[PDB]
Structures are given as structure tokens and as C-alpha cells.
Amino acid sequence: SRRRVVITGMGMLSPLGLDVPSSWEGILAGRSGIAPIEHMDLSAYSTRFGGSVKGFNVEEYLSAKEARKLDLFIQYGLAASFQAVRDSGLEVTDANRERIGVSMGSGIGGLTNIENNCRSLFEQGPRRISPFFVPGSIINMVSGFLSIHLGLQGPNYALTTAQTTGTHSIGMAARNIAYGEADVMVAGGSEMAACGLGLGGFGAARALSTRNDEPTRASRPWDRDRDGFVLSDGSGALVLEELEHARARGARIYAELVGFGMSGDAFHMTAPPEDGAGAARCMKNALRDAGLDPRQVDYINAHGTSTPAGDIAEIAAVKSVFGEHAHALSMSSTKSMTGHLLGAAGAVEAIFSVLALRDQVAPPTINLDNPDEGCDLDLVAHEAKPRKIDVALSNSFGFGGTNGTLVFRRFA
Amino acid sequence: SRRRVVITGMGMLSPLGLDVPSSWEGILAGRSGIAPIEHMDLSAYSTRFGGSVKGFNVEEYLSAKEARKLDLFIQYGLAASFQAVRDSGLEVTDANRERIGVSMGSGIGGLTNIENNCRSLFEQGPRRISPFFVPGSIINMVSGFLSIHLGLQGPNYALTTAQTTGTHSIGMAARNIAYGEADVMVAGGSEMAACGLGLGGFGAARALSTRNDEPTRASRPWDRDRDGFVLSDGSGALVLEELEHARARGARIYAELVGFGMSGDAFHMTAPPEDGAGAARCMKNALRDAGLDPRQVDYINAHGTSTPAGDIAEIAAVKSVFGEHAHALSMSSTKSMTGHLLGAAGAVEAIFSVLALRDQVAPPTINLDNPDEGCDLDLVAHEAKPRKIDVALSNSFGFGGTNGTLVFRRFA
Numbered sequence: 042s043r044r045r046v047v048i049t050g051m052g053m054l055s056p057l058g059l060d061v062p063s064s065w066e067g068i069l070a071g072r073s074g075i076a077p078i079e080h081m082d083l084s085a086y087s088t089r090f091g092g093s094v095k096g097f098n099v100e101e102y103l104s105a106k107e108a109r110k111l112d113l114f115i116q117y118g119l120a121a122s123f124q125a126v127r128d129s130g131l132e133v134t135d136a137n138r139e140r141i142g143v144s145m146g147s148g149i150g151g152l153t154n155i156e157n158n159c160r161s162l163f164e165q166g167p168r169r170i171s172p173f174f175v176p177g178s179i180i181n182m183v184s185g186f187l188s189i190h191l192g193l194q195g196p197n198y199a200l201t202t203a204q205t206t207g208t209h210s211i212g213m214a215a216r217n218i219a220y221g222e223a224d225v226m227v228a229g230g231s232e233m234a235a236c237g238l239g240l241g242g243f244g245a246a247r248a249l250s251t252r253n254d255e256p257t258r259a260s261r262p263w264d265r266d267r268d269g270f271v272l273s274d275g276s277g278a279l280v281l282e283e284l285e286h287a288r289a290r291g292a293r294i295y296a297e298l299v300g301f302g303m304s305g306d307a308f309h310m311t312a313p314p315e316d317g318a319g320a321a322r323c324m325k326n327a328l329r330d331a332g333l334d335p336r337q338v339d340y341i342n343a344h345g346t347s348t349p350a351g352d353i354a355e356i357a358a359v360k361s362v363f364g365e366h367a368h369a370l371s372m373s374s375t376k377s378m379t380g381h382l383l384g385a386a387g388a389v390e391a392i393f394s395v396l397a398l399r400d401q402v403a404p405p406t407i408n409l410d411n412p413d414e415g416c417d418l419d420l421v422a423h424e425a426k427p428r429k430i431d432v433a434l435s436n437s438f439g440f441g442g443t444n445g446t447l448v449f450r451r452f453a
Numbered sequence: 454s455r456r457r458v459v460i461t462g463m464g465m466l467s468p469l470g471l472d473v474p475s476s477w478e479g480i481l482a483g484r485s486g487i488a489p490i491e492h493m494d495l496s497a498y499s500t501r502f503g504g505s506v507k508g509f510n511v512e513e514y515l516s517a518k519e520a521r522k523l524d525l526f527i528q529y530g531l532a533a534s535f536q537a538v539r540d541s542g543l544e545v546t547d548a549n550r551e552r553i554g555v556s557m558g559s560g561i562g563g564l565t566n567i568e569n570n571c572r573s574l575f576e577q578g579p580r581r582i583s584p585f586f587v588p589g590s591i592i593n594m595v596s597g598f599l600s601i602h603l604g605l606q607g608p609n610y611a612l613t614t615a616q617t618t619g620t621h622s623i624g625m626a627a628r629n630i631a632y633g634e635a636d637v638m639v640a641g642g643s644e645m646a647a648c649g650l651g652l653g654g655f656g657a658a659r660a661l662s663t664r665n666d667e668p669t670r671a672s673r674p675w676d677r678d679r680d681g682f683v684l685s686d687g688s689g690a691l692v693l694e695e696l697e698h699a700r701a702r703g704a705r706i707y708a709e710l711v712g713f714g715m716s717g718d719a720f721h722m723t724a725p726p727e728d729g730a731g732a733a734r735c736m737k738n739a740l741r742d743a744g745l746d747p748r749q750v751d752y753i754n755a756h757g758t759s760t761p762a763g764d765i766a767e768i769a770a771v772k773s774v775f776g777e778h779a780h781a782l783s784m785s786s787t788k789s790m791t792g793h794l795l796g797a798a799g800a801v802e803a804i805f806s807v808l809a810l811r812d813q814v815a816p817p818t819i820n821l822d823n824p825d826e827g828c829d830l831d832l833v834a835h836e837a838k839p840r841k842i843d844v845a846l847s848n849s850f851g852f853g854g855t856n857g858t859l860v861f862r863r864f865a
């Protein structure tokens with residue numbers, strides 16, 4: 042009844058690479074992108090490391106002058122978006138531009154821009170605030186600037202669901218296409234919260250790993266010595282496309298997006314319920330949306346943020362949804378390597394789930410030296426595992442109990 | 454198949470009142486809610502007035518202790534949301550809680566809280582950043598906190614499309630219900646951008662009226678002496694409900710939501726095109742979505758922000774869409790009275806459009822003393838106009854060239 046939705050283009054900035062192939066090579070190699078932060082004085086901070094984008098040149102995408110108008114999170118979102126559109130080979134024309142939209146989100150948006158303009162405001166007064174402060178800092182300006190640059194006149198919006206943003210953005214973009222509002226959507230997320238406010242904010246909540254002595258070992262999902270998440274920056278974008286449209290132009294199809302689930306925990310502002318009941322409802326919703334039996338799932342890209350409560354809740358949710366099959370599927374947290382890109386986490390992890398299908402390899406959970414009590418599933422400890430993957434699930438859970446699941450399948 | 458969506462509950466904080474009835478009374482009376490700002494010293498600012506929420510008591514909704522953790526935009530969004538849910542008479546149960554979701558958005562979210570924590574960080578150090586900085590400031594936490602307080606386990610997300618947020622939030626929530634992801638959604642927007650960075654930021658862009666001597670006269674959509682928008686605070690929430698679900702429980706139905714349009718201008722970061730081409734595309738999309746002859750439109754709640762370029766572009770768009778019928782419909786800007794609530798604008802204006810249907814009256818455009826060149830439509834200058842309204846359209850246009858239109862009609 043609804044139209045089928047396929048992935049024809051992907052783009053990324055991550056702590057592992059300035060594009061998808063370099064990032065994916067890092068993932069399959071078990072490489073960490075976590076390092077002491079260099080771009081700011083963290084002397085007063087209990088966490089002094091994170092996943093930075095290393096060597097990003099915005100001038101490959103924008104003039105210096107246009108880039109100066111935009112927070113880093115918008116620059117990162119545009120870079121991933123331009124990559125994804127180029128990767129798709131899509132030609133935007135007068136005939137189709139009304140059928141091509143964009144939904145690129147962020148969890149936290151323009152903290153670095155706000156910090157910089159704050160400094161000017163407090164030291165000199167409001168006369169020193171940039172004229173571009175508002176349009177250069179608001180979360181919908183990845184969608185806005187991408188649409189202006191490429192001439193996209195389809196649905197133009199942005200989601201902000203904290204750490205679930207990238208997953209929800211991709212899922213709702215798939216709905217736009219499936220139910221006929223667009224033929225193509227650029228969807229995903231971007232984040233740059235490695236500023237005083239980001240590290241300070243999460244630090245004040247005591248939510249961050251403080252393993253400053255061994256940053257590459259800090260992100261250790263399901264390991265008994267985990268002590269909170271690692272803050273990371275970057276972006277992921279997918280070109281989502283109606284199947285008939287993709288086939289008509291001879292698009293290379295990476296995978297099909299067959300399922301999208303949402304749920305609210307309705308439990309706590311930041312903490313998940315012990316049994317992951319909302320995450321379980323969300324995964325079941327995604328599987329029902331895809332018309333799939335739980336036993337058809339081969340690979341789960343976990344939320345797996347390396348928090349004591351979250352990692353255990355996620356094991357409980359998977360055990361509830363999949364029963365005995367929980368022991369047959371493979372589940373890994375690529376955040377073991379990338380850290381937590383917050384709003385961009387679901388976008389880069391959708392891409393890793395699609396590449397898991399393409400290459401038939403489950404990425405590793407690195408740092409899983411001593412699995413905690415009840416963490417007895419195949420969590421792909423230490424090393425990439427070649428295996429059969431017909432169906433891959435990507436999970437994101439966020440503040441406010443907001444849950445999202447995407448289900449991808451090999452394209453037949 | 455596409456299910457019908459009705460409005461069964463509404464809630465509001467505005468510069469005209471602390472609920473819908475008091476706000477609507479102010480609208481039909483031609484009252485201004487614009488006044489010199491009292492909550493901060495604006496002596497260094499070019500604009501020193503706006504639409505404040507006057508006498509808001511968060512303790513009518515939340516404990517003092519919980520409220521201290523939450524930016525005003527979250528307090529305002531929860532107040533509107535609790536009002537809307539109470540107004541709907543809906544009882545949340547184990548049987549329906551997975552089918553009730555929330556999409557309450559904001560254009561900039563917790564700017565006041567971020568500014569205050571900025572000041573703590575720069576003046577005193579990161580040890581003075583609030584532990585509640587992130588959950589108290591990020592845009593998705595209206596949806597989060599509402600779901601926690603009421604036990605809502607359905608789709609839980611937030612849109613952020615600058616000044617189009619409230620319109621998009623309602624439209625996409627309607628799609629969730631229409632296509633079966635939920636039976637009920639609480640949808641709308643909230644904004645509190647009246648801090649140094651908000652007033653300073655819009656001020657630096659020269660986007661604000663500087664009529665400090667006569668604040669109640671500053672917002673004058675389509676008047677030749679207009680000189681930019683008036684910044685306003687508050688919130689709107691609607692309970693959207695599947696028609697058969699509403700009928701089954703004997704719900705009071707205000708109106709049906711029959712049409713939703715989106716488009717991108719793909720033109721400029723902040724400015725609309727002179728001919729309002731994107732706004733015209735958006736309205737035509739919404740009218741086709743509603744299965745309507747454009748001649749069925751009786752009343753348009755305009756974007757009408759009181760900017761020289763914006764107001765004219767909107768006249769051009771309406772003339773392009775409606776042709777001769779442009780002279781039969783009534784169009785007014787309630788922003789003449791409320792100012793521009795930014796992300797909440799579309800939410801409060803959806804409510805005013807629904808009440809225009811209920812009471813068969815077009816709200817006035819106050820301050821329209823001397824209509825500009827080509828502003829020769831029925832703009833309901835000065836005084837409310839009783840008239841036949843079967844179909845009401847609400848328009849929102851925003852930064853990034855984002856456009857949204859909602860189409861409401863009387864329900865028997």
C-alpha cells in the first residue's frame with residue numbers, strides 16, 4: 042500500500058574519518074577516534090577527552106565567508122549532506138525539485154556559536170552579537186542551507202530528539218517518501234557539543250566517563266568497569282529514495298529501509314527504566330512496521346553508550362523482544378570506537394548498519410574485556426565478525442525517554 | 454488508509470492571557486499584549502519591548518522544585534500541554550497510553566538557561582554549570598516531561614523549524630495519527646527567546662521594530678510604517694485525535710484538520726522571495742491535501758510578522774493562490790496583537806484559526822492605519838469581523854525558507 046524506501050547515498054564526518062569509507066575502515070579495524078581535546082582549555086573539567094572531527098576543511102563545501110555564518114554543527118551537517126547527495130548521483134531538476142526534501146537534525150545545536158556570542162555580549166554588550174547569530178545557530182539551518190544550495194523545494198524541516206535525533210530524522214523522512222509527500226529525502230543529524238557548555242553540562246550531570254588517563258579505553262559498552270559515555274562530534278546523512286524512482290535512474294541501492302519504530306518510556310528525564318520496557322516496545326513497533334518476525338534479525342547496532350544503567354536496560358530490552366533468538370543475533374556498540382555523537386549518533390549508526398548489510402560483517406564492541414552480569418549475548422567483543430546479515434536494526438534512546446529503531450534489509 | 458484528524462483540546466500561554474479563553478477574548482477585543490520588558494535592563498538594546506507572558510504561575514502546573522530545573526520555554530510548553538489534555542477530557546489508561554504521543558517544538562529552545570549557564574561558566578567556571586543544564590534546556594524536553602507527567606508512551610519527538618515550528622509540529626503530528634502511528638497527539642510549540650542573546654541577536658539582524666515610544670503600535674502588519682517584528686513569548690498545544698477515536702468516547706470536537714502543506718523557498722537564509730513563491734507552493738500543497746477548491750477558503754490567519762518584505766510577499770502569495778477569490782476571503786495577522794511567538798506562533802495561530810471556525814468571526818489586524826501599496830485585500834483592519842467561516846488556513850514562514858500551512862474546517 043505504502044511505497045518502498047531505499048538508501049542510495051551516504052555521507053559522514055566522524056572521529057574515525059572525514060567520509061564514510063574512511064570511518065567504516067576504522068570501525069572494522071577496531072580503531073578508536075577518542076583523544077584528549079585540543080581546541081579548548083579543559084583545566085577545570087573532570088573530562089578532558091572526546092571524539093573530535095580531525096582535519097575538517099569546510100572550504101571543500103562552502104566559501105570561507107559562507108562558513109563564517111554557520112555554527113560547526115551546521116558545517117558538519119552540510120558536509121555529510123553534500124557527500125550523501127554526491128554519493129547518490131541524484132540530478133536535481135525543475136521536474137523533480139519539489140519532490141526532494143531534507144530533514145537533518147541536532148540534539149543540542151549551536152552551543153559553540155552561543156558561547157562565542159555570550160562572550161561578546163557579557164564583555165562588550167549586545168552591539169557585538171553577530172548579525173548571523175540566530176540563522177547561524179538554529180537547528181533547522183542544515184535543512185535550510187542544503188535546500189538553498191541544491192534548490193530543494195520538498196519537505197524542509199528538522200527534528201530535535203536529543204540522542205535519538207538521527208534515528209527519528211531518518212525514520213520520519215522515510216515516512217514522507219513511503220506516504221507520497223516526497224520521492225527523495227536527505228536525512229540524518231549533526232552535532233558539535235565539544236565546548237565548555239557541552240563537556241561542562243554533561244560533566245555537571247556526572248554522565249561522562251572520567252577515564253582521562255586512557256581515553257581510547259573510556260567507551261566500553263557492557264564492560265563491568267564502564268563509568269559513563271564519551272562525548273563525540275560529527276554528522277551522518279543518507280539519501281532516502283522511493284524504490285521506483287531509484288530503479289528508473291539506475292541508482293546504486295545500498296539497502297532497503299523496511300521498519301521504523303518510536304516509543305516513549307514515560308519514566309524519567311534522563312534515566313531509562315531498568316528493564317528497558319520502552320526500548321522493547323520501540324523495537325517491536327519497528328519489527329511490526331517491517332512485517333518481520335524477531336527471528337529474522339541478524340545484527341543490532343546498539344545504542345550502547347557505556348553508562349551503567351543504559352547498557353543493562355538495552356540487554357534486558359533485546360532479551361524481552363528476541364527471547365532465545367537474542368543468543369543467535371549479533372549486537373555491537375560502534376560507540377566503543379566513535380563515542381556518542383548525540384543527535385548524530387543515529388545517523389552515523391544507520392550508515393554502519395547499512396554497511397554491515399553491504400559487507401556481511403558485524404562491527405566490534407571494542408574494550409569489552411569483562412562483560413558485566415547478564416551481558417551474555419554475542420556483543421562482538423574486540424574484533425569484527427563476518428556473518429550472514431539479511432536484517433540489521435539500529436537503536437537510539439535519548440533524554441525524555443524518547444526511543445527510535447530503524448530496520449534495514451538487504452535489497453532484493 | 455488515511456484516517457481523519459480532529460481537534461478535541463486546546464491550551465495556551467500568550468501575551469494576551471494565561472489560557473485560551475482569556476487570550477481569545479483579547480484577540481476579539483483588539484487588545485495588544487506588547488509592553489516595555491520588565492525582567493531585564495534593555496537600556497543598551499535598540500528594542501526594549503515585546504510580548505511577555507504576564508503573571509504566569511508555574512506552581513499551577515509543577516512543584517517549585519521541578520520548575521527550577523526547567524527553562525521558561527519548557528514551563529510554557531507544559532502549561533499549554535496540560536491545559537490542552539484537560540480540555541480534551543481524554544483519560545490516559547494502560548489500554549491507550551501507547552497510542553498517545555507528543556510533538557511540542559521550539560524555534561530556539563532554552564536560550565535564557567544557556568545564557569545564564571554561559572555566564573556561570575565564564576565568570577565562575579564549569580563547576581557552577583547546573584546538573585540540569587542539558588535536560589532543562591534542550592528542545593525535546595517539553596515532549597519528554599509531558600510524557601513523564603501524563604504517562605504518554607506513543608510517538609515522542611520535537612520539531613525545530615524556526616518560526617514555522619508550531620505549524621509543522623501540528624501537521625506532522627496529524628500525519629502520525631492519519632497513517633496509524635498514534636490515535637492522539639499533543640502538538641504545538643513554545644518559545645521564550647526574550648534574553649540578551651534573543652533580543653540582541655534579532656537586534657543585530659535589524660529584524661525587530663524599534664518603536665520603543667509606542668510598543669502597542671509597533672506590530673502593524675501590512676501598514677506602510679511597519680519596521681520589523683515584535684518578539685513575543687508563550688505556547689500553544691492542541692490535542693489531535695483520530696475522528697473515530699474521538700466519536701467513540703463522545704469527545705467535544707472543535708474542528709477537523711483536513712490539510713497540511715510544507716515547502717522550501719530554496720531562496721535565502723532569512724528573507725522570503727518578493728513574490729512569495731514558496732508560500733504559494735505551500736498553500737497549494739495544503740489545499741490539494743485537503744481536497745478543496747481554493748474558493749472554499751473563508752479566513753486566513755496570516756504569518757503577517759510586520760516586516761517590510763515579508764508582509765508584501767504574503768499578499769503576493771495569497772493573490773497568486775486565490776486569484777479573484779483573494780478579494781472574497783478575510784485574512785488577518787493576530788501578531789498585530791500578540792507579536793511574533795516564533796516557534797509557538799503557528800501553535801497559538803492554529804488555536805485562533807480553530808476558534809475563528811467555532812465563533813464565526815475573523816480576528817482583526819490592529820494598527821492597520823494605512824495599508825501599503827497593493828495591500829488591498831480584506832485584512833480585517835482594526836476590528837473583529839463576524840462572517841461565514843467554513844474553512845480557515847493558518848500560514849507560517851521561517852528562516853531557512855521553511856513554509857507550513859494548516860487547513861481547518863467546521864465539523865458537524
Ligand SMILES: Cc1cc2cc(C(=O)O)c(Cl)cc2[nH]1
Pocket residue numbers: 213216217220221222624625628629632633634
Ligand atoms: C506513519 C506515517 C505516515 C506519515 C506521513 C507523513 C507525510 O509527510 O505525509 C509524515 Cl510527516 C509522517 C508520517 N507517519
Ligand SMILES: Cc1cc2cc(C(=O)O)c(Cl)cc2[nH]1
Pocket residue numbers: 204270311312313317320344346348350351352354355358438439440
Ligand atoms: C534502554 C536504554 C539505554 C539507555 C541509555 C541512555 C544513555 O544514558 O545514554 C539513555 Cl538516555 C536511554 C537509554 N535507554
Ligand SMILES: Cc1cc2cc(C(=O)O)c(Cl)cc2[nH]1
Pocket residue numbers: 616682723724725729732756758760762763764766767770850851852
Ligand atoms: C511569504 C513570507 C513572508 C515572510 C516573513 C518572514 C519574516 O521575516 O517574518 C519570513 Cl522568515 C518568511 C516569510 N515568507
